[PDB]
Structures are given as C-alpha cells and as structure tokens.
Scaffold this active site. Structure first.
Site, PDB file in Angstrom:
ATOM      1  N   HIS A 173       0.729  -1.184   0.001  1.00 36.53           N
ATOM      2  CA  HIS A 173      -0.158   0.137  -0.130  1.00 36.53           C
ATOM      3  C   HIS A 173       0.922   1.192  -0.109  1.00 36.53           C
ATOM      4  CE1 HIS A 173      -3.784  -2.019   0.052  1.00 36.53           C
ATOM      5  NE2 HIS A 173      -3.483  -2.537   1.107  1.00 36.53           N
ATOM      6  N   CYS A 233      -0.241   2.149  -5.097  1.00 41.85           N
ATOM      7  CA  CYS A 233      -1.317   3.206  -5.407  1.00 41.85           C
ATOM      8  C   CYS A 233      -0.536   4.500  -5.209  1.00 41.85           C
ATOM      9  CB  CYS A 233      -2.615   3.045  -4.721  1.00 41.85           C
ATOM     10  SG  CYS A 233      -3.145   1.493  -5.297  1.00 41.85           S
TER      11      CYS A 233
END
Ligand SMILES: [Mg+2]
Ligand SMILES: [Mg+2]
Lengths: 4, 363, 364, 4
Positions: free
Chosen positions: B78, B127
């Site tokens: 992440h 991301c």
C-alpha cells in the site's frame, strides 16, 4: 483486480 | 558506465493489520530478488515490515551506499501520494493513517544523494492516490542536480496499481511485465520505456494503470553495468544443515531454506532409526516468542501448509518475522519413540545464531 | 502510429515588467517553430504574453485539438513549481506574484485530455524553484490515465533552467540540444533521453541543470508520425501604393511570429520630374505601442527582429510590429511621402492611410 | 548564465  | 557496487533493498508488505491484505507482493519481491542477484546486485529482501522495521532496513541500506554505488529500492504494498511526495505504508499502520506513520520516498532519495551514489533507482509498486487524512504540506529541501535518478512507478499519479484477485502465484501487473525485461543490457530508462509499452497491451488495466517513468539520468547507466559489507552478504546465508544424534541412536536431519531475508523454512526428518526403536517422530517447538509462531501452523507435512509456496519427506515450519529476533535463534527438537517391548520423550536445544537478516543487527 | 493532426503552441516570454528580462526565448521559439513545421505541425508561436493573453492563446490551442490529435506545448520564460505543480509566469506578473497571476500546466493537460488527444507533449523551458511567496495549496482532480503524456523539463524540480548571458542569437541551454535531435524518427521519449545525455556533456550547466523526462506514453508515438490554425496565420499581401504625384511605393509584409510582423517599404517608381522622394510609415494604433525612433530602419536588424537582411528584400525601410494580439480594431497606419519637383524650391508632403485588417493572430 |  486488487489495488495497492 | 561503471558501478562501484550495486545494492538493492526490496520490501513487500501484504499482511496489513488494519487495511486490505495483499497477496502478490510475496512473489513479486521473490522474483525481482532473484533477477537482481543475476545482475550482481547485493540484495536484501524483506516481507511484512512495521514502520520501525522499514526505517531500520532503509538505514542499513543507506549505510551500504557510498560514492559511485548504484542503489535501488523496490517497494510493493500500500502507498499514497500527496503533492508529488510518495509514501509507503507499513503493515502496522493505523486506520486511518497519516504521514507520520509512513516512509516518504523523497526523504530516502535525499539521503541516498548524500552518499554520492552513481545511480538512484526507485521502483514503486503501489497506489498513488491522495491520502485525505494527511493535511501536511511539508517542504523538503530541493534536491541537488545529480542527474542520476530514475523512478519507475507502477501507476500514474492519482491512480491505482494492481494485482490480480484469486491468481495463485501470479505476479502483480508491474512485475508481470518488468520481470521479462529486467535482464536486458540497456539503459534503465529505455528498459522501463519498453515495460510501459508491454503494460499498454494489458487489457485488464487499460484506463486504470500505466507505468510512469521519471528520469534525470544523463549517462547511459544500466542495471547490468560492471562493478569496478560482509554483514550485508551474510544476511542471505542460511544456517548449515545439521544431523542431530539423540541418546537412543535416532538421528534427525535439520535443514533450512530461505524465502526472504526475514523468512526461513526449517525442515526435519528422521535419517537413522535403530532397530531397537519401532517408531519415532521428531518436531520443533519453543521458539522465541518474538517470532510470533503458531503451533497449528508448524511441523506440517508440506511446505505449502505453512504458507511457504516457493520452497521445493519432512516436517516443515515457516519462520517469518526474523527481523523481530533480538537474541539468538534457539529452539528445541523434540523426539518421541518406543522400543520393541513398550513411549519415551527426549529433546535437544539448538542454536543457529543470528540467521539471515538478523546478521545486520538492525536492533 | 498515426496522428489525426499535429498542433503546437509555442510561447516565449522575455519583456517582464516586474522581473529580470530574458533574451533567448525569441531565438528558441523561432527555431523550434521551424523544426515543428518541418514535422508537419500546425504551429502558433507567440512572444511576450500577459496572463490574459496566455489563457486566450491556450483556449485557441485547445480548439485545434480533437480526438487523436497530437498536441505539444513549448514554453520558454520564467516559471516555478510548488507542491508538484508547474506554473508559467506571464510578462505582467507582479513582484512578488502568486499562482493566481500564473498558468498551471497541469490545468492545461487536463483540458487537453478532455479533447481525447492522441499525444500530449509539454516541453517546459523554465525554472522549477519553489515560489515561497505563493501560499496557495490548490488541489486539482486526479488526471485520467490516458497513457499518452510526455513532459520534457529543461531542468529538475527545485533547479533553474538557463540561457547564456550576453550571447547574440544563441539558444537557451535546452533548445541548444533539443534542436539537434528533434527531427529524428524515434519515440519522443527516446528522443528526449538522447537530449538528456547530450546536455549531460554541457560543462556550463553540470550540477545546475539537467533535463527531466516524465512519461506515461505506452505507445510508440513520435513527432514524425504521419497525419492520416487557419485564420490565425493570414498575412497581408504585398501592395503597391500610387501617390497623386505619380510616385509608387511598394509595401511588403513578413511574418516573424504569430504576433510579430515586419513591414517594409521601398520606392519602385519615381517620376523624373521629382528630384528626390522618401516614404515612411507612421501613426500606428496606440495598442501596439510602436515608438517612432524604432521604426523605418535601414536594416531589419535595427528593429530588433530575428530576421536578418538576407531574409528580406534589400534597400527598404523596415518596421517591426510586435504585440499584434493587443490589436482591438483594424491595423490602420499611414504611409507618408516627402518629395520635391525639379525647378521648384519647396518640399511637398503627402500621405495615405492603409488598412490591412487584422493580421496573423489578431484575426482572433 | 541567466536563469529563467
Ligand atoms: Mg512514525
Ligand atoms: Mg553493457
């Protein structure tokens, strides 16, 4: 799909 | 072009305590580790790191960097991006989290430049959406113009990077394409440009994910460049296999296999049993509590039963979290057996020192 | 790969009212215009634009963009970069100035994507230091992933881009190297990567300026890809004016930029009865702010033009009309004639008004 | 040199  | 050395730190975060868990960082990091070692990079690879652990790993990596060294960081997990600063989210991040919980990639780049590296490469497989909970507008010092910086982002600013659901040992999207180009003897920018074109043909991610390259690299440097400390090297050397002999004559082989710098598989088997003894079983127990092992998961007849999918008649135990070990890895090998003419229990304590990443004494 | 069309907007800002003036954008823009035209781009080249004029120019540029069209923007002038966003500083910016006085490049990219362009290229020939006097933290919407965006920045974030102090018609640093690579039939990313290496050898800027490339372009698109303005480039035709006394004066026009035109005059017939005559131009629209000490020069060079004598007919008088975008009404001016008849003692003066409508970018 |  799998997001990060 | 020449490197003084080539050093890489690879981190894959998957098992998030408070955020959606991922699957493919494991295979992504494992395969990239192997490819980089083929290119003579000195690689440390780590899975599932807390903020503290990430910072320590980065510190160790920065210590190996020096004038003319090529340094490469790959991160799968992440992440987010606010105002052009990219952040990597550790597995212990709270929900919600903010900048103080994460590592800022730009801070790492600045520290790398201070070591006067010959090349700085960041491959960010995460991301890049804004974190609305992060309202900080930090200004970092302008970077020096070292003209030797290359970023390969798995996706574009404001967009997501993907892996595939229910896809076994398939790579994430970025690595799926990167792995097939990484060994090319070409300037790193050109290599990434090729990967972007490959990814442009992936129907799954059209309109959702596209590689972004950012480069100020003004010399023809490549990951294949010729190279023209001991602890970093030892951090990937497994303990030697050992053959334990028990009082009763039974001998048990104890073997080790590496998945990552912080993940080792131990396996046991009976290699000799006296005729006296009709049956025996050996198993491992009493591991340092710092490793946080579950016994229902240990001593399995198969490696995949321990969640180890990259291993291949023993019992297998997965030790993940070796980075949490602050003392020696000491544990017990238990043996149960019976002599013709009726059950006995013996045990032997084993010390394998500071295995793999524990060699860096990050603590 | 194919382009539906290929369109470029080039802006060079030099005559800053409240900031150090620049010199090389003139040359940089002129030469890149010629190279892009050789690559079959429609090119609008504009110098010295205010904030209002820059936004207008961008609006006109966007009109030219449609699905599949390649759009390229080149900017040479003052600029800065705050919190991930690049800004171009117009010539009328105050000192200090803030984002409100400037154009944000990301906002232009967003508008271009909305046109469904086949390629978006930004060549930003400007400094990228932070503006500490700019406290705005504007959040723009996330851009769509169109995988067709390439930025070539003349320098890195937090650094300056340069031109050479006191150096005639020299290019700025970025164009010095880009010009020698631009015509190559290679993916624009590869092209820029070559330029970055060429610049890497420039001793003058080592440690101060290095090209940055940012790209999400996932197709092999190039500025050379085959195609498969209009009212903005109209020039007045040469005209021959006859005066009452019989003298004929030829008036010619030459385009230097989309907002700069040179006018030149010469005597093409003088009755023998007239011993001498002189023709010159005056009374231009106040909007163009022409100074008469700068008009009617014996050489183009003296008007401050990029064009040299070899570029235009010789033995004329030359006048440079810049800032054509400021023209509100028609371009009307006066051609004056002085002359004298053999055997008479008095100089006679005559004049005629000429109206050439709204030339070049003035056509709106 | 002259910066932009
Ligand atoms: Mg913290
Ligand atoms: Mg080679």
């Amino acid at each position: 799909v799998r997001p990060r | 072009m020449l490197a003084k050395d080539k050093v890489a730190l690879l981190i894959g975060n998957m098992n998030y305590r408070e955020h959606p868990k991922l699957k493919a960082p494991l295979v992504d990091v494992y395969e990239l580790t192997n490819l980089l070692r083929q290119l003579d990079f000195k690689v440390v690879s780590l899975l599932d790191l807390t903020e503290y652990e990430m910072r320590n790993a980065v510190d160790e990596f920065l210590l190996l960097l020096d004038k003319g060294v090529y340094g490469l960081l790959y991160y799968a997990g992440h992440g987010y991006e606010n105002f052009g600063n990219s952040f990597m989210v550790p597995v212990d991040a709270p929900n919600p989290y903010r900048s103080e919980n994460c590592l800022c990639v730009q801070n790492i780049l600045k520290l790398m430049q201070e070591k006067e590296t010959g090349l700085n490469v960041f491959l960010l497989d995460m991301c890049r959406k804004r974190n609305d909970y992060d309202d900080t507008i930090p200004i970092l010092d302008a970077l020096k113009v070292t003209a030797n910086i290359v970023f390969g982002y798995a996706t574009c600013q404001g967009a997501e990077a993907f892996e595939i659901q229910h896809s076994g040992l398939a790579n994430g999207i970025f690595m799926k394409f990167l792995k097939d180009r990484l060994l090319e003897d070409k300037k790193i920018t050109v290599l990434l440009d090729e990967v972007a074109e490959d990814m442009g043909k992936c129907h799954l991610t059209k309109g959702k994910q596209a590689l972004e390259i950012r480069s100020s690299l003004s010399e023809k440097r490549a990951l294949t460049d010729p190279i023209q400390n001991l602890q970093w090297a030892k951090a990937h050397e497994l303990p030697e296999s050992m053959c334990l002999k028990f009082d009763c004559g039974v001998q048990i082989q104890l073997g080790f296999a590496a998945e990552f710098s912080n993940v080792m598989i131990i396996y046991t088997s009976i290699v000799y049993k006296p005729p006296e003894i009709i049956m025996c079983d050996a198993y491992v127990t009493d591991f340092p509590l710092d490793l946080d092992i579950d016994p229902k998961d240990a001593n399995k007849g198969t490696p995949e039963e321990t969640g180890s999918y990259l291993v291949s008649h023993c019992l297998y135990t997965r030790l993940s979290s070796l980075q949490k070990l602050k003392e020696h890895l000491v544990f017990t090998v238990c043996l149960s057996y019976q002599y013709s003419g009726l059950t006995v229990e013996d045990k032997q304590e084993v010390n394998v020192g500071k295995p793999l990443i524990a060699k860096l004494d990050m603590h």
